[PDB]
Structures are given as structure tokens and as C-alpha cells.
Design an enzyme around this catalytic site. Structure first.
Site: not given
Ligand SMILES: CC(C)CN(C[C@@H](O)[C@H](Cc1ccccc1)NC(=O)O[C@H]1CO[C@H]2OCC[C@H]21)S(=O)(=O)c1ccc2c(c1)CC[C@@H]2O
Lengths: 99, 99
Positions: B25-27
Site C-alpha cells: 500500500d504505497t498510499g
């Protein structure tokens, strides 16, 4: 380009004739943008994450440019604290995770 | 590996001796896991997501293996809808975004 993850992966996008900053978010199925007055028809939707749900407006076939890469797809508009580029558009710009 | 985004970037992780599924989850600034028993001390913390704020238990310096890559860092445990691997650990395994 290659984006490291020491900091939030924020990039400039262009949508509805406006420039914005948005998160490249592999954890978001779909794209969610901060409240904006886009034209056209939309459908109500509820999306959930950490903390619960927010009510959003689903627009279809919206053109977005992400780092000079053009994309077109579904955009959810609502009271999100951050502009979120999700996989529906990340795939279109050739974005991958690599380790 | 190189991971495309037509599907959710789910991977197997090992933490506390147990295997689980988690989302790259890069966010997410932080790593947030669903309710579980973890050994060691922890401290109460608050985190905010798209829908508001939740209370989490913060475990520091926790061993966690992600798709065969070892990381040691902070894990938040709480009522998240999805096990998410955030940037604090994605950096440790050498993960980047590329397009
Ligand atoms: C939790 C994920 C599985 C799904 N989210 C995507 C994550 O990347 C969010 C993005 C975000 C960033 C900043 C503020 C708010 C959100 N990060 C997140 O919560 O991170 C936590 C941990 O670290 C901290 O740092 C950031 C905030 C804290 S989402 O935003 O809830 C979402 C999006 C689209 C869509 C849905 C759900 C459902 C349908 C639609 O497709």
C-alpha cells in the site's frame, strides 16, 4: 521514472483543466479526488477504509494526465483528505511495484 | 519481483510466527494489521484514514517478513478493514514505484 518510498509518492496530475497533487496509491482499487465541481452525470457511492466510509460521486470516463501520462477511467469525488490515484489509472500509465 | 496492478498487490507475510495476507500500500505511511495477538510491549496510538481516526496498538521494532524479504519496524494493530504494508516497511524491502 522510478519513485522511492521514503516520502509520500506525490505527483502532479491534470484533471478537469486543473493541476493538482495526488498520491500514487497501490492500495486503492479506484481513484478518489478531493471535492471538485466536475461537469456531467454521476452516481452516488460509499467507499470504506480506515475510520469508516465517506460518500463520493462516481464519474466515468474522466481524462487524467499523470506525470505526462494520459489516462481515462472512473474518478470518485468526495471529502477525501488527499487526492488518491488508484490502480484503475495506475495500470494505464504502466506503473508497477518493484523489489 | 515486478508486480503489475491489474489486481490487488496482495502478498503473504510472516509476523509473530503466523502467516497472513497483506496489501502492499504505497498510499499508507504506516503498516496497519487487523486485530491479532503479538508478543512484546505496545503503546496506544491514533491513526487517520479516509473515513476518520481509529485507535491502534503500536508495536515497535517488530520482525516481519514480506514476500520473502525481512523487515524490522513499527506495526500498528487495530480495526483496519485490510492488512496493509505501508511505506515504513516497503522502504526496508527495497520497494519502488516504476513507470
Ligand atoms: C486502507 C486501504 C486498503 C484503502 N485506502 C488506501 C490507502 O492507501 C490509504 C490512502 C490515504 C492516505 C491518506 C489519507 C487517507 C487515505 N492509506 C491509509 O489509510 O493509510 C493509513 C496508514 O498509514 C497512514 O498514512 C496515510 C493514512 C494512514 S483508502 O484510502 O481507504 C481507499 C481508497 C480508494 C477506495 C477505497 C479505499 C475503497 C473503494 C475505493 O477503491
Amino acid at each position: 521514472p522510478q519513485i522511492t518510498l521514503w516520502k509520500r509518492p506525490l505527483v502532479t496530475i491534470k484533471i478537469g483543466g486543473q493541476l493538482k497533487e495526488a498520491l500514487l496509491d497501490t492500495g486503492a482499487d479506484d481513484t478518489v479526488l478531493e471535492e471538485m465541481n466536475l461537469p456531467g452525470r454521476w452516481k452516488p457511492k460509499m467507499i470504506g477504509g480506515i475510520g469508516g466510509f465517506i460518500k463520493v460521486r462516481q464519474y466515468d470516463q474522466i481524462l487524467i494526465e499523470i506525470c505526462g501520462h494520459k489516462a481515462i477511467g472512473t474518478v470518485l469525488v468526495g471529502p477525501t483528505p488527499v487526492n488518491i490515484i488508484g490502480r484503475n489509472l495506475l495500470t494505464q500509465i504502466g506503473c508497477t511495484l518493484n523489489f
